[PDB]
């Protein structure tokens, strides 16, 4: 007779090719990349002959075999490809093979091959669009947004984007390297802990809990190898295999290390760390460099050098040569992008007409033109054009785009920025002709999360009734609201100014639109990005 039918023993059924150590705070110990998951299966035979060979089958295919020597057995073996597999134990002799019922096992890998797709309904005012314009539609999701802002990856309207950027991946370094972090309580210390034992100028993860461990929809079981933003982004990639998910390195507070990269030793180390990061976290499709800014005038008043333009171009060229090696190894297309100042004074510190040859997209940061950081000179923070009362206004979207075009940047590379937030002032006074921007302020407006800044959701929700005036400036293409009794003035993007930007993008053959930051929209802003670029509804 053939052998008795074995019963699979109860035991762990989730294993990982890239393992996350659940009690480690240092990135180097937290993440263990293996060539294959170490899988274990045990079985008992309660009736009959145990056979002479025992096999572990994954979807019918043998992963292990050995002699069947008793009523219970254990197999330890390696599986080098992620997925959910119907595992069976089979006992075989000369008279045939008898297979157990199947038990599903998980062999996790960071492409999310082991995850059910994260396909979540659109929330708030988001309406469905098809990505058929061939234009970029991007937004940034922030790692720390899962706490107070309570905005998680399952809340992203992912069908309505071509690009989803993850803010932000830090670069390791302590004193003198990441001093701008010190302005945020605990932030510099969290980075030193993540980077313990790791060389400076290598990338890391700033908050490994939020990235890998915090329970979230789809990744809530204790034994799920990946949880947090990264586990959900893996599942999101399964739902949206054409969405480009880019890790963004830098931003306002994490840009200091770039200013050292004129040293090719550091720059090589950084580039090699990026390659390793993309080999480790397979759901990412490239890299976004948000260096704020070559030449300085970013967060750190002690950094900035005339050499920065040359460093920027060398960095983009070497990142591209690294991505072309990675693309060759994997067959995938990887993108290289950068978010850049939209101010002509910062733009002309870099030869973008040379760097564009390495890059897929330039994310033009056509926002933060004005704000509570200057109480004396007020203006539209994200306007397309200058306003009628000051046509020589330096900081407008069109001035930034024209600066690039005059360098010789191809229009199709340029992605125009929209704000999902307003900036504002309180106590505005001394203005003429009913134009509050001609006055001066005494402070920042009360903000949603920080002074001087309000989520677009809150503007739409809270500041469109009672005493608040609303005006759409059609020369600048820019809405604002004003409460004259307190002098509260807020400058923002809305559906209409976004429509004007999209129209302009199409008119000038630019690359598309992107936004900061996705948690702050109620749907209005992203809906308008999609519609104005000509994406079809549905
Ligand atoms: C108003 C706002 O959202 N500010 C955040 C600031 O955002 C700027 C970006 O860094 C620039 N890069 C882009 C890409 S778009 C562009 O503009 C936005 C808005 O001006 O980013 C900071 C990080 O660089 C944010 O800091 C975060 O602040 C919260 C507390 O407010 C804190 O909990 C986070 O730890 C801190 N994150 C980091 C990495 O420092 C700021 O919120
Ligand atoms: C036109 C111009 O150069 N405006 C400056 C602002 O850019 C800058 O604010 C900063 O803008 C960045 C995007 O270009 C943001 O990344 C950043 O969060 C923001 N910094 C702050 C503190 O809001 C300010 C610097 O305060 O100066 C303006 O002149």
* Sign of the alpha-carbon torsion through 440, 426, 378, 436: negative
Instruction: Indicate the number of domains in the chain.
Output: 3
Is the CB of 394 inside a 6 Å radius of any atom of ligand 1?
no
Same domain assignment for residues 87 and 149: no
Containing structural domain, residue 92:
1-107
Q: Which ligand is nearest to the CA of 288?
A: 1
Same domain assignment for residues 413 and 428: no
Burial of 457 per CB tally in 10 Å (0-12, 13-18, 19+): buried
Same domain assignment for residues 79 and 180: no
Residue 308: name the closest of 250, 363, 259, 252 by CA. 259
Distance from Cα 256 to the centre of ligand 1, integer Å = 14
Pocket-testing residue among 140, 178, 251, 382, ligand 1, by greatest number of atoms within 8 A of Cβ: 251
Q: What is the CATH number of the domain that holds 51?
A: 2.60.40.10
| Three-state DSSP state, 439 | coil
Residue 68: name the closest of 12, 9, 10, 6 by CA. 6
Same domain assignment for residues 357 and 429: no
Distance from Cα 499 to the centre of ligand 2, integer Å = 24
DSSP state of 18: E
Same domain assignment for residues 100 and 249: no
* Region of 519 on the Ramachandran plot (φ > 0 left; ψ -120 to 50 alpha; else beta): alpha
Boundary of a domain, candidates 57, 81, 107: 107
Which atom of ligand 1 has the smallest separation from the CA of 253?
24
Residue 278: name the closest of 270, 286, 288, 266 by CA. 286
Same domain assignment for residues 383 and 409: yes
> Which residues is 91 bridged to in the sheet?
54, 98
CA distance 53 to 92: 5
Contact at 8 Å (CB) between 457 and 463?
no
Q: Whose CA is closest to atom 15 on ligand 2?
A: 252
| Beta-strand runs (E) in 156-215 | 163-169
* Sign of the alpha-carbon torsion through 142, 145, 149, 155: positive
| Beta-strand runs (E) in 127-209 | 136-142, 163-169
Residue 386: name the closest of 478, 503, 469 by CA. 478
Same domain assignment for residues 384 and 463: no
CA distance 203 to 281: 12
| Three-state DSSP state, 41 | strand
Same domain assignment for residues 479 and 369: no
Same domain assignment for residues 116 and 73: no
Contact at 8 Å (CB) between 58 and 41?
no
Q: Whose CA is closest to atom 14 on ligand 2?
A: 341
CA 462 vs. chain centroid, Å, equals 29
Is the CB of 144 inside a 6 Å radius of any atom of ligand 1?
yes
DSSP string for 472-492: EETTTTEEEEEETTTTEEEE-
Same domain assignment for residues 119 and 99: no
> What count of other Cβ atoms lies within 10 Å of the Cβ of residue 197?
9
Phi, psi of 376 (to 5 degrees): -105, -35
Same domain assignment for residues 387 and 321: yes
Contact at 8 Å (CB) between 274 and 287?
yes
Contact at 8 Å (CB) between 111 and 283?
yes
Is the CB of 43 inside a 6 Å radius of any atom of ligand 2?
no
Contact at 8 Å (CB) between 167 and 143?
yes
> What count of other Cβ atoms lies within 10 Å of the Cβ of residue 25?
13
> What count of other Cβ atoms lies within 10 Å of the Cβ of residue 374?
12
Is the CB of 449 inside a 6 Å radius of any atom of ligand 2?
no
Per-residue 3-state assignment (H helix, E strand, C coil) for 113-126:
CCCCCCCCCCCCCC
Say which residues have a Cβ less than 8 Å from residue 455's Cβ, sequence separation at least 6.
420, 421, 448, 449, 519, 520
Distance from Cα 458 to the centre of ligand 1, integer Å = 18
Same domain assignment for residues 296 and 188: yes
Distance from Cα 461 to the centre of ligand 2, integer Å = 26
Q: Which residues are catalytic?
A: 292
CA distance 385 to 398: 6
């Amino acid at each position: 007779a053939a052998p008795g039918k074995p019963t699979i023993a109860w035991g762990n059924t989730k294993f990982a090719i890239v393992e996350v150590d659940q009690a480690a705070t240092a990135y180097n110990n937290l993440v263990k990349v293996k060539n294959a998951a170490d899988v274990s299966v045990s079985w008992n035979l309660w009736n009959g002959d145990t056979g002479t060979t025992a096999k572990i089958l994954l979807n019918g295919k043998e992963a292990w075999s050995g002699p069947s020597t008793g009523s219970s057995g254990t197999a330890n073996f390696k599986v080098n490809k992620g997925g959910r597999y119907q595992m069976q134990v089979a006992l075989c002799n000369a008279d045939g093979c008898t297979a157990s019922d199947a038990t599903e096992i998980v062999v996790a890998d960071t492409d999310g091959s082991h995850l059910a797709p994260l396909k979540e309904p659109l929330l708030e005012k988001n309406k469905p669009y098809k990505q058929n314009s061939g234009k970029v539609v991007g937004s940034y999701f922030v790692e720390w947004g899962v706490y107070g802002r309570n905005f998680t990856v399952d809340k992203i309207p992912a069908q309505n984007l071509t690009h989803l950027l993850y803010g932000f991946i830090p670069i390791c370094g302590g004193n003198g390297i990441n001093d701008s972090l010190k302005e945020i309580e605990g932030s510099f210390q969290a980075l030193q802990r993540s980077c313990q034992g790791r060389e400076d100028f290598k990338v890391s993860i700033h908050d490994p809990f939020a990235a890998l461990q915090k329970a979230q929809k789809g990744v809530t079981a204790w034994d799920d190898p990946y949880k947090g933003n990264f586990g959900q982004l893996m599942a999101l990639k399964q739902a949206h295999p054409d969405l480009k998910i880019l890790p963004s390195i830098g931003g306002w507070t994490l840009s200091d290390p770039f200013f050292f990269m004129g040293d090719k030793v550091k720059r090589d180390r950084f580039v090699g760390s990026v390659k390793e990061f993309l080999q480790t976290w397979k759901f990412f499709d490239g890299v976004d460099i948000d260096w704020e800014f070559p030449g300085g005038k970013g967060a750190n008043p002690n950094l900035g050098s005339p050499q920065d333009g040359e460093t920027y171009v060398l960095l983009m060229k070497e990142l591209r040569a690294m991505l072309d090696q990675l693309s060759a190894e994997t067959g995938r297309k990887y993108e290289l992008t950068s978010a850049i100042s939209a101010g002509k004074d910062k733009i002309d510190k870099v030869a973008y007409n040379v760097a564009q040859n390495s890059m897929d997209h330039i994310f033009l940061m056509s926002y933060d033109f004005y704000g509570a950081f200057d109480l004396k000179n007020l203006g539209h923070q994200t306007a397309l054009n200058a306003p009628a009362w000051k046509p020589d206004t330096a900081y407008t979207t069109v001035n930034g785009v024209n600066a690039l075009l005059t360098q010789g940047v191809k229009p199709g590379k340029i992605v125009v920025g929209t704000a999902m937030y307003g900036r504002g002032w309180t106590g505005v006074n001394g203005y003429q002709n009913n134009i509050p921007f001609t006055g001066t302020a005494t402070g920042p407006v009360k903000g949603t999360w920080e002074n001087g800044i309000v989520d677009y959701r809150q503007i739409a929700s809270q500041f469109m009734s009672g005493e608040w005036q609303y005006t759409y400036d059609a020369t600048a293409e820019a809405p604002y609201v004003f409460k004259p009794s307190t002098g509260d003035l807020i400058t923002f993007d809305d559906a209409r100014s976004v429509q004007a930007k999209g129209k302009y993008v199409l008119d000038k053959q630019l690359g598309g639109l992107f936004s900061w930051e996705i948690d702050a929209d109620n749907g209005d802003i992203l809906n308008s990005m999609n519609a104005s670029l000509g994406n079809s509804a549905g």
